[PDB]
Design an enzyme around this catalytic site. Structure first.
Site, PDB file in Angstrom:
ATOM      1  N   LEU B  12       8.839  22.440  31.223  1.00  0.00           N
ATOM      2  CA  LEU B  12       9.554  23.420  32.031  1.00  0.00           C
ATOM      3  C   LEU B  12      10.813  23.929  31.338  1.00  0.00           C
ATOM      4  CD1 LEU B  12       9.248  21.913  35.603  1.00  0.00           C
ATOM      5  CD2 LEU B  12       7.731  23.428  34.358  1.00  0.00           C
ATOM      6  N   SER B  14      14.582  22.516  28.757  1.00  0.00           N
ATOM      7  CA  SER B  14      15.372  21.431  28.188  1.00  0.00           C
ATOM      8  C   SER B  14      16.825  21.866  28.057  1.00  0.00           C
ATOM      9  CB  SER B  14      14.817  20.982  26.825  1.00  0.00           C
ATOM     10  OG  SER B  14      15.145  21.897  25.787  1.00  0.00           O
ATOM     11  N   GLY B  16      18.452  16.579  27.558  1.00  0.00           N
ATOM     12  CA  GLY B  16      17.129  16.198  28.018  1.00  0.00           C
ATOM     13  C   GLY B  16      16.110  17.314  28.208  1.00  0.00           C
ATOM     14  N   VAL B  18      12.417  18.602  30.613  1.00  0.00           N
ATOM     15  CA  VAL B  18      11.771  18.527  31.920  1.00  0.00           C
ATOM     16  C   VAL B  18      10.350  19.049  31.802  1.00  0.00           C
ATOM     17  CG1 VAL B  18      11.931  19.112  34.364  1.00  0.00           C
ATOM     18  CG2 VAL B  18      14.008  18.952  32.973  1.00  0.00           C
ATOM     19  N   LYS B  33      11.684  14.449  34.330  1.00  0.00           N
ATOM     20  CA  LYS B  33      12.923  14.759  33.629  1.00  0.00           C
ATOM     21  C   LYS B  33      13.318  13.587  32.743  1.00  0.00           C
ATOM     22  CE  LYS B  33      17.750  16.263  34.323  1.00  0.00           C
ATOM     23  NZ  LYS B  33      18.778  16.814  35.261  1.00  0.00           N
ATOM     24  N   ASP B  94      13.463  29.877  39.764  1.00  0.00           N
ATOM     25  CA  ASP B  94      14.865  29.578  39.992  1.00  0.00           C
ATOM     26  C   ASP B  94      15.610  30.870  40.318  1.00  0.00           C
ATOM     27  OD1 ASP B  94      16.367  30.740  37.643  1.00  0.00           O
ATOM     28  OD2 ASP B  94      15.235  29.290  36.471  1.00  0.00           O
ATOM     29  N   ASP B 133      28.152  21.627  39.864  1.00  0.00           N
ATOM     30  CA  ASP B 133      27.551  22.656  39.004  1.00  0.00           C
ATOM     31  C   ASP B 133      26.694  23.612  39.837  1.00  0.00           C
ATOM     32  OD1 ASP B 133      27.236  24.023  36.564  1.00  0.00           O
ATOM     33  OD2 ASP B 133      25.596  22.725  35.874  1.00  0.00           O
TER      34      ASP B 133
HETATM   35  O1  LIG Z   1      16.097  18.989  37.867  1.00  0.00           O
HETATM   36  C1  LIG Z   1      16.670  19.358  36.801  1.00  0.00           C
HETATM   37  O2  LIG Z   1      17.751  18.905  36.375  1.00  0.00           O
HETATM   38  C2  LIG Z   1      15.998  20.435  35.972  1.00  0.00           C
HETATM   39  N1  LIG Z   1      16.621  20.771  34.856  1.00  0.00           N
HETATM   40  C3  LIG Z   1      16.031  21.735  34.081  1.00  0.00           C
HETATM   41  C4  LIG Z   1      16.661  22.158  32.889  1.00  0.00           C
HETATM   42  C5  LIG Z   1      16.090  23.136  32.118  1.00  0.00           C
HETATM   43  C6  LIG Z   1      14.890  23.724  32.495  1.00  0.00           C
HETATM   44  C7  LIG Z   1      14.253  23.338  33.643  1.00  0.00           C
HETATM   45  C8  LIG Z   1      14.814  22.332  34.463  1.00  0.00           C
HETATM   46  N2  LIG Z   1      14.182  21.973  35.623  1.00  0.00           N
HETATM   47  C9  LIG Z   1      14.764  21.051  36.365  1.00  0.00           C
HETATM   48  N3  LIG Z   1      14.202  20.696  37.559  1.00  0.00           N
HETATM   49  C10 LIG Z   1      13.033  21.154  38.196  1.00  0.00           C
HETATM   50  C11 LIG Z   1      12.491  20.408  39.236  1.00  0.00           C
HETATM   51  C12 LIG Z   1      11.376  20.876  39.912  1.00  0.00           C
HETATM   52  C13 LIG Z   1      10.791  22.084  39.561  1.00  0.00           C
HETATM   53  C14 LIG Z   1      11.333  22.828  38.521  1.00  0.00           C
HETATM   54  O3  LIG Z   1      10.781  24.031  38.174  1.00  0.00           O
HETATM   55  C15 LIG Z   1      12.450  22.368  37.837  1.00  0.00           C
END
Ligand SMILES: O=C(O)c1nc2ccccc2nc1Nc1cccc(O)c1
Lengths: 8, 271
Positions: B12, B14, B16, B18, B33, B94, B133
Site C-alpha cells: 500500500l 511506505s 516502515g 504497509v 504495517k 485516503d 498528526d
Molecule cells: O496505518 C498506517 O499508519 C498507514 N500508513 C501508511 C503509510 C503510507 C502508505 C499507506 C499507509 N497506510 C496505512 N494504513 C492503512 C490501513 C488500512 C487501509 C489502508 O489503505 C491504509
C-alpha cells in the site's frame, strides 16, 4: 498551483 | 505464526511499509504495517511489561469498540521489527487523494467529513490519546459506508494537560506556538490542525506552506466559502492558543448544524 503530500 | 495466519498482498505504501492482506481465518481484509525497531522514536510498555512502540500502546487504548479510528487487530514482534495488523476498509481512498481528484469539496460534504473527524478525535482524547498528526493523508474514507477512519498514530502521545516540547507530526499542520517557541498544549494544537484540515477540504489545498505564513495569522480564501465556514476556520486558526475553540464550541458552531448521516453522505456524494 502545486498540491503535494508532506512527510512527517 | 504470522506468515501462516495472514495472506500478504500488494504494497500500500511506505515511509516502515504497509501491505494489503487477508486474514486466512475468515477472509477479513487487513493492512499489515511493518515498523523498523531502529526507527522507533518513543517507546512504551504494555500491562504485561513487554516494551513496545508507543504506537502500539496508543492503538490499544483507542481500539476498544467501534469508532472512526482504524483498529489494531493483532501485533507481532520480530528480531528487527514490529508487525501491526490493522483493519482495512474496502473500497477505500485516503482523503488526500480524494481532495486531489475532486477539488474543493462542497460544504455539505466537508461538513459531514469534518464532523466525523471531530468525533474520532474526541474519542482519542477520551481514551487518553493525542494523535498529533491530523491531516488529510491520515484519514481514510470507506467509500461504501461513507465513514472516515483516522490512521497512523506513529507521532502520537499520551494526552496530558502540561506543555509538549517534542513534535514529529507534519510541520505545515503544526501551530504557530510550535514554530515560534517549540512548545504547545495538546488540545489547542489539535484544534489548529483541524482548522488547516477544514480549509484544505473547502479550498482544495492547505492554506500555509511556509513558516512565515503559519505565524503570520492571515487566512486568504482562494475559493468561494460561506461566511459561516470562514468564521469557523479563522477561529480554529487563532494565533493565540487560548483564543481557539474547544471541541464543544466547534460542534456547536452554526456552520456545523444539520450534518448528514454517514450512509446519506455515501449515497449523495460517494456512490
Ligand atoms: O496505518 C498506517 O499508519 C498507514 N500508513 C501508511 C503509510 C503510507 C502508505 C499507506 C499507509 N497506510 C496505512 N494504513 C492503512 C490501513 C488500512 C487501509 C489502508 O489503505 C491504509
Amino acid at each position: 498551483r502545486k498540491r503535494r503530500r508532506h512527510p512527517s | 505464526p504470522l506468515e501462516s495466519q495472514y495472506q500478504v498482498g500488494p504494497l500500500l505504501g511506505s515511509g516502515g511499509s504497509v501491505y494489503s492482506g487477508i486474514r486466512v481465518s475468515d477472509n477479513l481484509p487487513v493492512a499489515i504495517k511493518h515498523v523498523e525497531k531502529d526507527r522507533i522514536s518513543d517507546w512504551g510498555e504494555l500491562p504485561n511489561g513487554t516494551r513496545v512502540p508507543m504506537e502500539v500502546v496508543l492503538l490499544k487504548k483507542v481500539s476498544s469498540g467501534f469508532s472512526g479510528v482504524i483498529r489494531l487487530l493483532d501485533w507481532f514482534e520480530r528480531p528487527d521489527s514490529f508487525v501491526l495488523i490493522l483493519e482495512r476498509p474496502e473500497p477505500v481512498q485516503d482523503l488526500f487523494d480524494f481532495i486531489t481528484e475532486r477539488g474543493a469539496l462542497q460544504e455539505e460534504l466537508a461538513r459531514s467529513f469534518f464532523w466525523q473527524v471531530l468525533e474520532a478525535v474526541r474519542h482519542c482524547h477520551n481514551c487518553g490519546v493525542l494523535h498529533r498528526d491530523i491531516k488529510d493523508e491520515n484519514i481514510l474514507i470507506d467509500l461504501n459506508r461513507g465513514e472516515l477512519k483516522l490512521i497512523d498514530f506513529g507521532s502520537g502521545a499520551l494526552l496530558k494537560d502540561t506543555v509538549y516540547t517534542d513534535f514529529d507530526g507534519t510541520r505545515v499542520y503544526s501551530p504557530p506556538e510550535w514554530i515560534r517557541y517549540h512548545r504547545y498544549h495538546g488540545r489547542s494544537a489539535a484544534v489548529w490542525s483541524l482548522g488547516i484540515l477544514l480549509y484544505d477540504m473547502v479550498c482544495g489545498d492547505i492554506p500555509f506552506e511556509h513558516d512565515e505564513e503559519i505565524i503570520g495569522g492571515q487566512v486568504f480564501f482562494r475559493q468561494r466559502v460561506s461566511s459561516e465556514c470562514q468564521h469557523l476556520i479563522r477561529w480554529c486558526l487563532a494565533l493565540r492558543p487560548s483564543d481557539r475553540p474547544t471541541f464543544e464550541e466547534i460542534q456547536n458552531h452554526p456552520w456545523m448544524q444539520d450534518v448528514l448521516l454517514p450512509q446519506e453522505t455515501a449515497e449523495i456524494h460517494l456512490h
